[PDB]
Symmetry: C2
Subunit: 95 residues, 2 copies
């Protein structure tokens, strides 16, 4: 079976509505040779963040289980990277 692909296909709405930045995702997929320039360009053509997430998920899924697993670990990494600053960033406090 493909448990990581299934995770993406089964929780699409969560991902589509709750990823507010797709550039870090594309940049990392490019750097690690999972996305081509072509793939990034296709994602670029999608105007809105939700539309872009949909495209990214569609591409990742079609590339298969290993790319899907890599994507989920990337999300984990990114979600953890700056999370411990969240309290301070409210206190300072930015517009």
């Amino acid at each position: 079976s493909h448990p990581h692909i299934q995770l993406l296909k089964s929780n699409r709405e969560l991902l589509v509505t709750h990823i507010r930045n797709t550039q870090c995702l594309v940049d990392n997929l490019l750097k690690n040779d999972y996305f081509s320039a072509e793939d990034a360009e296709i994602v670029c053509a999608c105007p809105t963040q939700p539309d872009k997430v949909r495209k990214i998920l569609d591409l990742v899924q079609s590339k298969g289980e290993e790319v899907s697993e890599f994507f989920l670990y990337l999300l984990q990494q990114l979600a953890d990277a700056y999370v411990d600053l969240r309290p301070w960033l409210l206190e300072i406090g930015l517009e």
Copy 2:
């Protein structure tokens, strides 16, 4: 005065210990023409994440108030980008 520079210089330890990824930061500073290739290379030479954060802060600060403000808004943006996935990513559940 330089309130955003002061914010970086006064909360260095928080930032140095609680930023776990510097690549998104460098990538965005490069894309927006605040960092040169030279600057990225200098950050690259720092082995550990804490060492890299120190270097990034030093460079941002020396570039001045507007770059410091941009940096703080970047941290805000990045901290918000995937934060709403944090509960799900525990549930699934990755290594």
